Amino acid sequence: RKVQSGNINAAKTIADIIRTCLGPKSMMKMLLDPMGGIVMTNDGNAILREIQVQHPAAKSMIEISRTQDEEVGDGTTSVIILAGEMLSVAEHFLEQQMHPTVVISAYRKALDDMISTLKKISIPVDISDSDMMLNIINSSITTKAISRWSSLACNIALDAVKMVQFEENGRKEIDIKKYARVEKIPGGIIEDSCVLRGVMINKDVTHPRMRRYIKNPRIVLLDSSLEYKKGESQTDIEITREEDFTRILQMEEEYIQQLCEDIIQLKPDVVITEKGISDLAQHYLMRANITAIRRVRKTDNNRIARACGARIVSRPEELREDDVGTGAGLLEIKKIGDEYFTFITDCKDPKACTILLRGASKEILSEVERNLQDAMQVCRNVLLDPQLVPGGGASEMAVAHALTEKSKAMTGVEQWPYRAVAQALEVIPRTLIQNCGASTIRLLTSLRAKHTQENCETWGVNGETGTLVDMKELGIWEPLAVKLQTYKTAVETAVLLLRIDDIVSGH
Amino acid sequence: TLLIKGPNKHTLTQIKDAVRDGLRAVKNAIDDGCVVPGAGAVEVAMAEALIKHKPSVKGRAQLGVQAFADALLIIPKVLAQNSGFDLQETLVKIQAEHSESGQLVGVDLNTGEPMVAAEVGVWDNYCVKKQLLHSCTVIATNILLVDEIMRAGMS
Amino acid sequence: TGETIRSQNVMAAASIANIVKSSLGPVGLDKMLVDDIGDVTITNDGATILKLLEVEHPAAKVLCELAD
Amino acid sequence: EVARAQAALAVNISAARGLQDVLRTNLGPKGTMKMLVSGAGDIKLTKDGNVLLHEMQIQHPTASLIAKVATAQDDITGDGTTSNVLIIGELLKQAD
Amino acid sequence: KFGEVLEISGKDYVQEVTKAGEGLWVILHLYKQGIPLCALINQHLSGLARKFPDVKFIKAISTTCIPNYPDRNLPTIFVYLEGDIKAQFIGPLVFGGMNLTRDELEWKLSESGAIMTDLEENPKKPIEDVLLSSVRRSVLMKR
Amino acid sequence: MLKEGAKHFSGLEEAVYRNIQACKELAQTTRTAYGPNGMNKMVINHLEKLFVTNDAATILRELEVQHPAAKMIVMASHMQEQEVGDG
Ligand SMILES: Nc1ncnc2c1ncn2[C@@H]1O[C@H](COP(=O)(O)OP(=O)(O)O)[C@@H](O)[C@H]1O
Ligand SMILES: Nc1ncnc2c1ncn2[C@@H]1O[C@H](COP(=O)(O)OP(=O)(O)O)[C@@H](O)[C@H]1O
């Protein structure tokens, strides 16, 4: 029994790195470069990403933390600390007789009891009014950021969140990552950011000749199968001589005539094209009562695949009679600013609005981007479950007390690991007290003696002074799903690290 | 055009840098309308106001107030050391002169006697002292919060 | 020679057999395998361990061949 | 890999005291000038604070970072890079 | 004309300066046994050759060029054309350790500049400082 | 230690020592002349002819010094030579 010890040693070594980086009064780490550089930062994720280890358990924990940060976005630091504490309090004390069997059942029972206690303590909330949501967002975002234009940004983010939801059918699916981006354009007053349809068009449309103005037509986008290819599936035609180049014009004319005879009744406009631009064929194409655009990047592809819904397949002609393009859509090339902008309004797949902000340099861009990101993340974490829990260090004490009471009432045989895993939940209050700068023994004793009278479970420790205060007068609340996900991830990591036998090599 | 000549060496660049610093100081002294005296007559009054007339009564705050006030008397000591005199004698002389009179007493670089810098011609700026204090506070703040220094990184 | 290489083969067989010993039955621990690259595979099946394992001994090779 | 002590603050205070003791004899009109020569024997006389801090070979990374931070805040006012490291060093010594 | 990776000895390294035409950007990888970085580089090149068959990739065991070498000849890559050196690389510091996934192709496209497929984006870059960034932000806000 | 790289022996104590000893050693190889006397010195550089001179101008024009205190005087010497005749 030496592999588990070597695994928990590396686990505790990894966990004892970013332990003093929690709370408003956190420390700052510094990393030196081998060439002669030094960078100081207080971000645990940056230190975890810039680290290089060699143990498989450390890499697995890093991957788990990265997955937890990418899936949720809040609560990717205390998981490793809790896992290391549970390991050091369980395996480093209850493995002298070598019995790795009842520990898994004890962990499962403790997880079930913690889930039941956290579910039987939540309070309901209403989502009718908007002032309470804004107040909750402002209270949860007051961490380490500027305070000057946070109200307007949070209001715009809440409006975008309430407007981007449309995929409801019983499962409540919310997607804002690949469904709402950010646009930037300098010039003008900074007090005009709002929401708009948002079309990724800058300098892609090129009209050498002056034609008619676009008012409110019916644009029906097709596919991208008109480049430097050899045809459909045979090599009968190849772009090699000028005769083939001038026959390509007649071929495209015949193709557009076949398309018009097939399924052209709303008169589309521009079409997606990757290759194909000249000074003679483009004139004939424009004269053929059709237009074509080029210069398409990944952003335009994502926009036409999300908002419009354009797919990629080997089928340019003969499509569905009612595929895309259903509704009156205006496309006026406005001259506001200095670049060409399109405002495709009222078309297919609505509720896909983006933001419109006019700042200045790149600092304003970065700050509004991070503000929108954190506000949208907070709104998504809050709207996912209308249940709040008083954080700060009040629910963990009640959970530990309930677990101890259940263990004393059941009077079982495996009560020692249960008590060990129940008493290993007071790490966050101890760390907060240590970061505040006070006694970690007398304060803990007072908090333990206070959480046992009658109806007292909202008394936590202030993160700025170092005294016990009720949560009903401060205003520190956390969502419910985040704590459950954190506990489940910690339990799964402990189970995975506890079920490791021998390690060998292979192919 | 400010045409300058030199004896064909590298001191011409030094003279150009000196005249550029002088022009910058003149431009800084023309944008505002308030000029406070210098010659080490502002740190003494600041320390006397921070030590005596305490804003509040707290030992924890005083433990830092005393350290911040004791670090502002290094400029006159360094000036007296570089001028060629003592360090504590001139200091206590200036202290007694400021406690008996009550005016801005400067430092003399000729005889080491306490004199008034408001009648000779020594002047200074306004925003320069504020910027220096802000920079010193920013530097001294983000230093004591250093926990541990690990050896990692690749880029 | 003679009685030495036989003892060596017996020791090698015992060492290669004392690996899948703690994985018999439905109640067993997991085993991690590395391909000397960076990826790890966690499995508790005896067949998967015997199939994904490096060998260098002739007796062990013929034993793995007979098992397959 | 594993370090849980207070040697970082100690070496920081040591580097700050060294940087304060290195540059401290260039205050007042009665100071001493300095010379710099290394590239093809180019004699360059200087006495300023930013000009010296911008053209030096410091072997300590913390002192180099402190000098860079001090020089980055010199484009605000006229000349304020001098008479700054002494007060910072005194405050750091008092804090230590 | 080339899309596979083969093992050469010493004759190909000399005949490549005469067999190449129209400026063939050949690449040679010094493979070392017992290092996973070489295996990762080979696995990446196995896909990079199929992604762009307009160039040539070859691998050679670090034992031909200067056989009397200690442990300083670190495994790297060498890009050649007709007999000119275009800033060769050495050491794993330029790659980024064992955390390389999509930076080698970006560096190759930046060094070549002829088959750029809209890959002019900037890398992630190392972590920034908390003091210099704050100073720059304060300067931008004051002015 | 903090600024230099074990190249020069400069600090807060070499001023009243090396800056004077360098000039003393530079001037000690010059007091042998100055006056109507026969103290010829041979000069061997690149001509490979072995010629003896008496004036200090050709002696200083061939000697290569690697010290700033010794180089601070050759400039004044050249200035005096360009100004008036002797000296
Ligand atoms: N005003 C406050 N009063 C009490 N506790 C606070 C206060 N502000 C922050 N905290 C506590 O500090 C902790 C900060 O955690 P955080 O570092 O954000 O976790 P993560 O790094 O996983 O996002 C929170 O758990 C919260 O309970
Ligand atoms: N005429 C003067 N008489 C006495 N002290 C002076 C005089 N001019 C400047 N000082 C002193 O020099 C110090 C600043 O000198 P220095 O660091 O060289 O910056 P600056 O060149 O801007 O004066 C001030 O603290 C001031 O007390």
DSSP per residue over E28-95, as a string? EEEE-TT-HHHHHHHHHHHHHHHH-TTSEEEEEETTSS-SS--S-----EEEESSS-B-----STTTT
What was the elucidation method? cryo-EM
- Give the residue numbers in E contacting B (CB under 8 Å), as ranges: 93, 96-97, 99, 125-126, 130-131, 134-135
Distance CA C44, CA C22 (A): 9
∠ CA A208-A209-A215, rounded to 5°: 105
Residues B146 and A40 sit within 8 Å (Cβ to Cβ): yes
CA of residue A403 to ligand 1 center, whole Å: 24
Pocket of ligand 1 (CB under 6 A): A 22-24, 74-78, 391-392, 460, 462-463, 476
Amino acid letter, A437? G
Residue B142's Cβ-count burial label (10 Å; 0-12, 13-18, 19+) is middle
What is the spatial distance between Cα A384 and Cα A172, in angstroms, rounded to a whole number? Answer: 9
Q: Is residue E97 domain-resident?
A: yes
Whole-angstrom Cα distance, residue A153 to residue A136? 14
| Inter-axis angle of helices A415-422 and A395-410, nearest 10 | 170
Residues of C near E (Cβ–Cβ under 8 Å) read 36-38
Q: Is B28 on the interface with D (CB under 8 A)?
A: yes
Resolution (A): 3.1
Chain A residue whose CA is closest to D66: A38
Give me the residue from E99, E125, E131 closest to B142, CB to CB. E131
Task: Find the angle CA(E87)-CA(E90)-CA(E93) to the nearest 5 degrees.
Answer: 115
Distance CA(D1)–CA(A4), nearest Å, equals 21
Q: What is the CATH number of the domain that holds A207?
A: 3.50.7.10
Question: Which amino acids of A are annotated catalytic?
Answer: 43, 76-77, 374
Is residue E105 one of the residues assigned to a domain? yes
Flag whether E81 is in a domain.
yes
Say how many residues make up chain C: 68
User: Using CA atoms, how far apart are residues A225 and A316, in angstroms rounded to an integer?
Assistant: 6
Residue E107 included in any domain:
yes
Please name which of D89, D75, A465, D68 lies closest in space to residue B143, comparing C-alpha atoms: D89
Would you say B153 and D83 are in contact if contact means Cβ atoms under 8 Å apart?
Answer: no
Instruction: Please state, in angstroms and rounded to a whole number, the distance separating the CA atoms of residues A459 and A397.
Output: 10
Q: Encoding tokens for residue B145?
A: 């919060």
Contacts of A429 (CB under 8 A, 6+ apart): A393, A396, A397, A444, A447, A460, A461
- Chains in contact with A, where contact requires at least 3 CB pairs less than 8 Å apart: B, C, D, E
DSSP per-residue letters across F26-61: HHHTTTT-SSS----EEE-SSS-S-EEE-SHHHHHH
CATH code where residue E56 lies: 3.40.30.10
The alpha carbon of A428 is separated from its chain's Cα centroid by a whole number of angstroms, namely 25
Of E93, E127, E137, Cβ closest to residue A50: E127
Ramachandran sector of residue F75 (left: φ over 0; alpha: ψ -120 to 50; beta: rest): alpha
Q: The domain containing residue E35 runs over which residues?
A: 6-111
Alpha-carbon distance A476 to A392, whole Å?
7
Q: List, in sequence order, every residue forming a beta bridge with A503; answer none if it has no partner.
A: C32
Question: Which residues does A114 contact at the CB level (< 8 Å), separation at least 6?
Answer: A399, A403, A487
Question: Does residue E1 lie within any of the structural domains?
Answer: no
Q: Is residue E74 assigned to a domain?
A: yes
Nearest residue on chain D to E138, alpha-carbon basis:
D73
Comparing CB atoms, the residue among A13, A16, A38 nearest residue D62 is A38
Structural domain total, chain E: 1
A98, A59, A142: which is closest to A497 by C-alpha? A59
Residue E28 within any structural domain of the chain: yes
Nearest-Cα distance to chain A for E10, in Å, is 32
How far apart, in Å, are the Cα atoms of A401 and each of A108, A455, B40? 18, 13, 63
- 8 Å CB contact of B151 and A32: yes
Q: Is residue E30 within 8 Å of E75, Cβ to Cβ?
A: yes
Which residue range is the domain that position A283 belongs to? 199-356
Residue E72 lies in a domain: yes
The answer to whether the beta carbons of residues A293 and A272 sit under 8 Å apart is yes
